[PDB]
Amino acid sequence: AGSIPGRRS
Amino acid sequence: AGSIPGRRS
Amino acid sequence: GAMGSMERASLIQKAKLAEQAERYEDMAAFMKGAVEKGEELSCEERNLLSVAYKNVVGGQRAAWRVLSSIEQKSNEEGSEEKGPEVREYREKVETELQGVCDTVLGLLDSHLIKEAGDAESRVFYLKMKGDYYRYLAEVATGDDKKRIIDSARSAYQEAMDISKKEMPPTNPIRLGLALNFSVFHYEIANSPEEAISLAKTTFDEAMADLHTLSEDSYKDSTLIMQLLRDNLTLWT
Amino acid sequence: GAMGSMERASLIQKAKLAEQAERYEDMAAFMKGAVEKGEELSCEERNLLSVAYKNVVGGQRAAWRVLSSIEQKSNEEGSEEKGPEVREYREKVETELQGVCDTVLGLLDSHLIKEAGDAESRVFYLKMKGDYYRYLAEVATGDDKKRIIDSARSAYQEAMDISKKEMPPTNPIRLGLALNFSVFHYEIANSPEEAISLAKTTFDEAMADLHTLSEDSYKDSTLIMQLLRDNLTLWT
Ligand SMILES: *Cc1ccc(-n2cncn2)cc1
Ligand SMILES: *Cc1ccc(-n2cncn2)cc1
Ligand SMILES: [Cl-]
Ligand SMILES: [Cl-]
């Protein structure tokens, strides 16, 4: 299950 | 130009 | 802090440089210094703060999962005793992860959330608060695991309430909040039906609002809708 | 150091765990503690030391290159003044990289190399010494850049002399030493013809010795021969 990756602005 | 990657034992 | 002597603008500039260099520990320290200047954060600055700490804690969570899996295998039937080392090192990584989460939660509590009046900023910070309590919940086992879970739920719920009142159903912050809250339901709260229902309702209400969007906003919203769809495909 | 209270065997065990968790800073600290126990390192332990620091400095070199490229663009004709931040942050990363290289060189000098009597250990450590002076040379600009380059050359040359006397031409340490020394010639010493000649002679002499090898040793040697071939393809 994937949350928001949010690792690149 | 590539040296020995050497990042995995 | 160590960043007290650097200009706010320089901290922001160096946080952007650190992202380009994939130096996320530095990026997080720079953005922590920027927050501690005491001024509110712009939309772009909030994203820099989030990206920095998500990468830092993301590496710690990945390492904790590797070590927790090794530890569980060592405590099975037929496993040879290897000593305290696996547990000790998992605890070390776990403690470092909890420290990062506490640092982020401290920034939100002192004083980002109380000064955030617009829906865009307030929902963003409350989503962050839910996320980092969720990461604490992933490793929690003791007297406070239930309170950590309820702290995550409470922050997500307040963010959801505001976003439903103040944002269109396609707003990317609203969509990402619902995505992560659904992951909370599935992975943390043992409520897979609530997770599936939230993901479905979020997706369908966004779909019906796409016609109002520009080409660029459409791309932003449909990207996150696909993440909702990916989870539903995995869960059903 | 901070590892003085942990058992040597536990440090080695945790270094292996840190590699699995991709926690290379931890891995390097664990192996530094193991070295500082004062006993010589086994073949496997030498590899753990090398892998840990290669990953750490590899991340720093990648970041330094990103930042150095940004810095050079800012100092071109028509570039807008952005202030001291890019230079300052490149210097910070550069200083951290130099500290790691100095730490590794200090471990080799106190006292890994002087206690290394077998060709396998001595060539391994001298190759390491050449590598980390090479990394120092990549960022050097001042009064000592020539001395750093000669320190790299001298360590590589001693390792080469021993490996040609004591190891077969297919030995993976001998092959990797020649590969990196050729990269030194091409990238650091401005001697591309020496780099090409060394790579070619190393490849051809290994090819002629492959018939003596087992299937598993053949796989090890041909892998590094392909790296020599890749460089020759790029250089010619
Ligand atoms: C929490 C969150 C929501 C949405 C996004 N995002 C990604 N691309 C556009 N918007 C990031 C983080
Ligand atoms: C310096 C060096 C030489 C060779 C190897 N290697 C990789 N696979 C087998 N041997 C690693 C590092
Ligand atoms: Cl530990
Ligand atoms: Cl800096």
What's the Cα-to-Cα distance from C81 to each of C6, C67, C72, D115, D148, rounded to whole Å? 51, 16, 12, 34, 48
- CATH number of the domain residue D196 falls in: 1.20.190.20
In a domain, C186, yes or no: yes
Ligand 2 site, residue D173, Cβ cutoff 6 A? yes
D201 close to D182: Cβ distance less than 8 angstroms: no
In a domain, D149, yes or no: yes
Place of tokens 């772009």: C44
In a domain, D68, yes or no: yes
Using CA atoms of C200, C206, C208, C210 in order, give the dihedral in degrees to the nearest 10: -150
In a domain, D1, yes or no: no
Question: Residue D187, by phi and psi: left (phi above 0), alpha (psi -120 to 50) or beta?
Answer: alpha
Which ligand 1 atom is nearest residue C124's CA? 1
Range of the domain at D60: 8-235
* Coarse DSSP helix, strand, coil percentages of chain D, rounded to the nearest 5 percent: 80, 0, 20
In a domain, C143, yes or no: yes
Domains in chain D, number: 1
Q: What is the number of the ligand closest to the CA of D218?
A: 2
Exposure on the CB side of residue C69, measured as CA atoms within 13 A: 8
In a domain, C120, yes or no: yes
Q: Resolution, in Å, please? A: 1.8
Cβ contact C85–D21 (<8 Å): no
D211: tokens are 């018939």
- For residue C57, count CB atoms less than 10 angstroms from its CB and return exposed for 0-12, middle for 13-18, buried for 19 or more: buried
In a domain, C182, yes or no: yes
Q: Whose CA is nearest to atom 9 of ligand 1?
A: C220
A3 close to C185: Cβ distance less than 8 angstroms: no
On chain C, the residues whose CB falls within 8 A of the CB of A2 are: 179, 183, 227, 230-231
Cβ contact B3–D180 (<8 Å): yes
In a domain, D214, yes or no: yes
D140 CA to centre of ligand 1 in angstroms: 41
